[PDB]
Short mmCIF file of C-alpha atoms in Angstrom, two decimals:
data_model
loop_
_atom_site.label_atom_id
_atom_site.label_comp_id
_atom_site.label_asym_id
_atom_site.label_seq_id
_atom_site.Cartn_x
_atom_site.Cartn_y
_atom_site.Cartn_z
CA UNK P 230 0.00 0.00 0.00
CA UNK P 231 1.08 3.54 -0.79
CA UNK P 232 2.73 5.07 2.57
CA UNK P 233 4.23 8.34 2.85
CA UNK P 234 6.12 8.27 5.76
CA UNK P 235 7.59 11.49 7.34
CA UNK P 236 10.39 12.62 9.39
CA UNK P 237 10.50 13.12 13.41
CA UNK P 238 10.12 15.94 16.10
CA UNK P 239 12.24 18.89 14.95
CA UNK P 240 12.77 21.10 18.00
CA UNK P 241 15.15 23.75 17.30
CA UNK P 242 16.44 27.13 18.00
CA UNK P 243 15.65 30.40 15.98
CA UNK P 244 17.15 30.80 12.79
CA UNK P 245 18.19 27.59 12.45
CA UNK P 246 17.05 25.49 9.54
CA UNK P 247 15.64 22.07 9.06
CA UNK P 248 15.15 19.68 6.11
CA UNK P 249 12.23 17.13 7.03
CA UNK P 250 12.00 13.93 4.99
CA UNK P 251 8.92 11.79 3.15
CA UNK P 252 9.79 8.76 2.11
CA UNK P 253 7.42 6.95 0.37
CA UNK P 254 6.74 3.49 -0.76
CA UNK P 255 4.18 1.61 -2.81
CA UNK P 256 4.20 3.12 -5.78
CA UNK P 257 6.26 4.71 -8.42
CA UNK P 258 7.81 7.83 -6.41
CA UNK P 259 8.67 9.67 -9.79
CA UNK P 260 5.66 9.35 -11.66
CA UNK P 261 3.77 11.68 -9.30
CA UNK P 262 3.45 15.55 -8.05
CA UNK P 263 4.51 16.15 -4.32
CA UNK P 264 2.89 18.77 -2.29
CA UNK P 265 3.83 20.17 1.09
CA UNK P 266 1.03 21.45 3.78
CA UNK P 267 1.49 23.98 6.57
CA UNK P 268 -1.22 23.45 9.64
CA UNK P 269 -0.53 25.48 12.64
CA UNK P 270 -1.50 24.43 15.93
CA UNK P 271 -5.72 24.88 16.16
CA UNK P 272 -5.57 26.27 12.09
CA UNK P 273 -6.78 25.40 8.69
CA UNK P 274 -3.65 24.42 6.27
CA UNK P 275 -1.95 26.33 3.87
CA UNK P 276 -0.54 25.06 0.54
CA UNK P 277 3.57 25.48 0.34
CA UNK P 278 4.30 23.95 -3.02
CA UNK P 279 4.71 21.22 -5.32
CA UNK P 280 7.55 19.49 -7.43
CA UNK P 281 7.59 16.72 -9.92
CA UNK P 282 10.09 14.62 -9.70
CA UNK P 283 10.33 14.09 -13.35
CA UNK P 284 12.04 17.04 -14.21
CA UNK P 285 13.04 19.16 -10.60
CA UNK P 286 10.13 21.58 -11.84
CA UNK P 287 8.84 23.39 -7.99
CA UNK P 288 5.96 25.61 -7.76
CA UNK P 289 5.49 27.89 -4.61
CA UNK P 290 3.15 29.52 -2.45
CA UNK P 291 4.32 33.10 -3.14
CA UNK P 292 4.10 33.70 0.97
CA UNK P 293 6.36 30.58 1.82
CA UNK P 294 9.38 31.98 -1.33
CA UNK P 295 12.35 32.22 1.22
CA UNK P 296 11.17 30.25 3.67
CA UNK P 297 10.67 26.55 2.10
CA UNK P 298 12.67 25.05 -0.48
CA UNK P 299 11.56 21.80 -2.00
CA UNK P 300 13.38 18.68 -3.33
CA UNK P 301 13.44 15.17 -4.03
CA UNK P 302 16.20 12.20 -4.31
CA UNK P 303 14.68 10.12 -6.85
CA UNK P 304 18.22 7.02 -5.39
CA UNK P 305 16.29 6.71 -2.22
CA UNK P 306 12.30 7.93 -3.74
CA UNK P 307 12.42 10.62 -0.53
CA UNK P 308 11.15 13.92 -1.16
CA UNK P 309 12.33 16.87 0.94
CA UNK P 310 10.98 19.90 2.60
CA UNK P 311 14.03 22.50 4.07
CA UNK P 312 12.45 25.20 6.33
CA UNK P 313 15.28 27.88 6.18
CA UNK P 314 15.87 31.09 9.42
CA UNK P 315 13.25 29.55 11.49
CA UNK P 316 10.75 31.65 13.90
CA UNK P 317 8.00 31.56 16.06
CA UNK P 318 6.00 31.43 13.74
CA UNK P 319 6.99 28.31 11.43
CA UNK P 320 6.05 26.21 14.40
CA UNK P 321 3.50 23.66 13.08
CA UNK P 322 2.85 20.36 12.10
CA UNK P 323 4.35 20.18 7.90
CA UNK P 324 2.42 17.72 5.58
CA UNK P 325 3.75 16.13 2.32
CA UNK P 326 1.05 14.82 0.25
CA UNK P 327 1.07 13.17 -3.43
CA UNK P 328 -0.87 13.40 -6.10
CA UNK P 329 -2.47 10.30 -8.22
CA UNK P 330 -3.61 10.50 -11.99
CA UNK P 331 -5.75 13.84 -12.52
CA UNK P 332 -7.81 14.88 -11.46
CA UNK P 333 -7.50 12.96 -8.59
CA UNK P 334 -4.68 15.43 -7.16
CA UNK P 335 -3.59 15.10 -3.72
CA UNK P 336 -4.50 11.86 -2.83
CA UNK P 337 -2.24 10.19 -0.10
CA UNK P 338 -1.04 11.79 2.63
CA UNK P 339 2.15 11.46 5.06
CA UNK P 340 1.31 11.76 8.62
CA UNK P 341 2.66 14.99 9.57
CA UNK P 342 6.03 16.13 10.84
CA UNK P 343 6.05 18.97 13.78
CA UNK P 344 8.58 21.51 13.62
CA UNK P 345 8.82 23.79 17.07
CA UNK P 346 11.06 26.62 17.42
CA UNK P 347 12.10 27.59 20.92
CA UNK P 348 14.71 28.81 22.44
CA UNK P 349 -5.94 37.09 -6.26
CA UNK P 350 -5.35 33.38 -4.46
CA UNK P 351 -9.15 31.79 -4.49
CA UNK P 352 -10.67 32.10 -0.77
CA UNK P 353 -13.04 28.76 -0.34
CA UNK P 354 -15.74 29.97 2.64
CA UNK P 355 -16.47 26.73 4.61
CA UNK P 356 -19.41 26.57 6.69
CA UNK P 357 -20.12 25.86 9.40
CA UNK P 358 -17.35 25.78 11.43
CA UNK P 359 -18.65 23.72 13.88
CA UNK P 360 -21.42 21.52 13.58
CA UNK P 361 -23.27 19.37 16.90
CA UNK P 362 -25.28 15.97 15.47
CA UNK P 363 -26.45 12.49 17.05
CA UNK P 364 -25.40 8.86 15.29
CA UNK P 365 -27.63 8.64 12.61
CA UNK P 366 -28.40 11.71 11.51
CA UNK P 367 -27.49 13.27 7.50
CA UNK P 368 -25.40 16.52 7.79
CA UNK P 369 -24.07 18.89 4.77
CA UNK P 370 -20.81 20.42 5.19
CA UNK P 371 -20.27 23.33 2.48
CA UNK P 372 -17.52 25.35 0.88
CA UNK P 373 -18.28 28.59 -1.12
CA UNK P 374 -15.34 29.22 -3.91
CA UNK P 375 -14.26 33.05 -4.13
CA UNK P 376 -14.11 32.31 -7.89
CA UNK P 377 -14.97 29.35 -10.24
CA UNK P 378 -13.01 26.63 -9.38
CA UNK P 379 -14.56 23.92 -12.12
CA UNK P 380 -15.00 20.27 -10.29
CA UNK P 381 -11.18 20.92 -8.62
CA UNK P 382 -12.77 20.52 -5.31
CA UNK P 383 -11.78 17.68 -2.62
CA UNK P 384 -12.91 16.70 0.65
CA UNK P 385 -10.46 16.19 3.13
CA UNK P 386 -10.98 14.29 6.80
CA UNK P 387 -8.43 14.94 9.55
CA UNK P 388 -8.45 12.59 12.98
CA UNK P 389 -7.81 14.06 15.91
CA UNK P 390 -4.19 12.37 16.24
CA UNK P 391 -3.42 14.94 12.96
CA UNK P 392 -3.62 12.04 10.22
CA UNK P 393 -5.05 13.14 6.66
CA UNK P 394 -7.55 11.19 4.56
CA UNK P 395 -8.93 12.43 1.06
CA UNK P 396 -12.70 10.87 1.05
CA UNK P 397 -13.95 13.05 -1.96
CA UNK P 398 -11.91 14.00 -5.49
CA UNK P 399 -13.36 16.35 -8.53
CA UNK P 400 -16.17 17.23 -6.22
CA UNK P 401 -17.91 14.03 -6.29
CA UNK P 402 -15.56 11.06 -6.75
CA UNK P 403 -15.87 8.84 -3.84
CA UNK P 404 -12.30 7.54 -2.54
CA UNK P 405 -11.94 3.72 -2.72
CA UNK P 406 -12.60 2.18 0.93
CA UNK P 407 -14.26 5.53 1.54
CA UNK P 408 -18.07 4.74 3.01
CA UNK P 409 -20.53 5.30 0.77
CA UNK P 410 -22.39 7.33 3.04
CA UNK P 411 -20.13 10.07 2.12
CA UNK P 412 -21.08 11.49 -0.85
CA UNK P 413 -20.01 15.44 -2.19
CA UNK P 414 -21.90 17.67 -4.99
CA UNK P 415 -22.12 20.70 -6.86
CA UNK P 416 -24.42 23.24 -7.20
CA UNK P 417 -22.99 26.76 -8.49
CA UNK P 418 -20.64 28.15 -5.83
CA UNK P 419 -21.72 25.79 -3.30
CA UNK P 420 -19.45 22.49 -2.68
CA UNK P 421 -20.89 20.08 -0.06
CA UNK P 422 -19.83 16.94 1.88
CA UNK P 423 -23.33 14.95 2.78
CA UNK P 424 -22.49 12.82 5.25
CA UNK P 425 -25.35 10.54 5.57
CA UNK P 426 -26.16 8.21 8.34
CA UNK P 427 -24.06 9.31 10.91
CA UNK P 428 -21.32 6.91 12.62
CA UNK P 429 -19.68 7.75 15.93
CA UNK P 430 -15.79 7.93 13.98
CA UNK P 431 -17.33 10.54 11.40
CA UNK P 432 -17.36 13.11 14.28
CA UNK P 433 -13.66 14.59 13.60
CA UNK P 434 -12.84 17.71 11.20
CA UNK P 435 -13.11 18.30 7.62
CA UNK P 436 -11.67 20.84 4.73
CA UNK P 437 -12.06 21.54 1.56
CA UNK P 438 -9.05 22.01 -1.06
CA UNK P 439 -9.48 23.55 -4.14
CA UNK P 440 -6.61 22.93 -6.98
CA UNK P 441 -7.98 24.54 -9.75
CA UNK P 442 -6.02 27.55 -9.26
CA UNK P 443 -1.91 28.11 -7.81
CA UNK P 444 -2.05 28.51 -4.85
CA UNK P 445 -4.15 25.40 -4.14
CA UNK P 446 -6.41 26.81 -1.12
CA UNK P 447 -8.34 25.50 1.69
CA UNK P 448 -11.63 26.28 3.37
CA UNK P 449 -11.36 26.80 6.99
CA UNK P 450 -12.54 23.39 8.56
CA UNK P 451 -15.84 22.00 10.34
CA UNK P 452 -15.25 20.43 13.60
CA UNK P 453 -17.90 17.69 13.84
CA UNK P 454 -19.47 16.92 17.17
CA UNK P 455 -21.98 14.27 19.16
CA UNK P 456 -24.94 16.07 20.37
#
């Protein structure tokens, strides 16, 4: 099975840098985009970049030029993130994630590295952010796109140990294993996760990630909770 597998604990002293590692396995670590995710403590994520490691060919976030550099070693299929002059606040927990054929675009994900330091871009409205239901029940999660983002929508879950899990590609392709009471649509500006049929391990968080556009963006999370 695919597995990208990240680096440890990097606790470190300002200005110093670090270069956090995802090593991957189970499949063909060339043949596919890798992205790296910023999530600060309590935050929705942020898009860094991407590089294919085809050709060396890295795309930034224009905030995170100067900050994170991006490589791969194709001898030992481990991609790279180096955090350069670190502060305050680059302390977070840094995601790599791959893509698969398009338009299924960022859909594995490693399981999160923190970093702590101690001594025009489409906006995606997600609402609501918080959202109390019983076992059972049928609730609609929903992101608004700040401008037309086509069917380059996903729905992403996150645990609350940090781990990532694409359920929902091109706005309504179901991930394999995914239950089918998950289901996501369309309908103008409106993106929505139905989650029918509540079960108790559905009650975590959710974003959505739009990747029609550089910089991929994402909404700002729904935290899901029992009544």
């Amino acid at each position: 099975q695919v597995q990208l597998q990240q680096s440890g604990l990097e606790l470190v002293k300002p200005g110093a840098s670090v270069k956090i590692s995802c090593k991957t396995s189970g499949y063909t670590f060339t043949e596919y985009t890798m992205h790296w995710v910023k999530q600060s403590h309590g935050k929705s994520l942020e898009w860094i970049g991407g590089i294919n490691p085809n050709n060396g060919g890295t795309s930034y976030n224009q905030k995170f030029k100067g900050k994170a550099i991006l490589t791969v070693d194709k001898s030992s299929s481990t991609a790279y993130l180096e955090l350069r002059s670190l502060t305050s606040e680059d302390s977070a927990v840094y995601y790599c994630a791959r893509d698969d054929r398009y338009p299924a675009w960022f859909a594995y994900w490693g399981q999160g590295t923190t970093v702590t330091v101690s001594s025009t871009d489409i906006q995606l409205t997600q609402s609501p952010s918080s959202l109390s239901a019983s076992l059972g029940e049928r609730v609609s999660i929903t992101c608004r796109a700040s401008q037309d983002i086509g069917s380059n929508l996903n729905w992403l879950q996150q645990k609350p140990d940090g781990t990532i899990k694409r359920l929902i590609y091109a706005t309504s392709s179901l991930d394999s294993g995914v239950p089918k009471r998950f289901s996501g649509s369309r309908s103008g500006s409106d993106y929505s996760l139905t989650i029918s049929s509540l079960e108790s391990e559905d009650f975590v968080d959710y974003y959505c990630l739009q990747y029609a556009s550089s910089p991929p963006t994402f909404g700002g999370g729904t935290k899901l909770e029992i009544k």
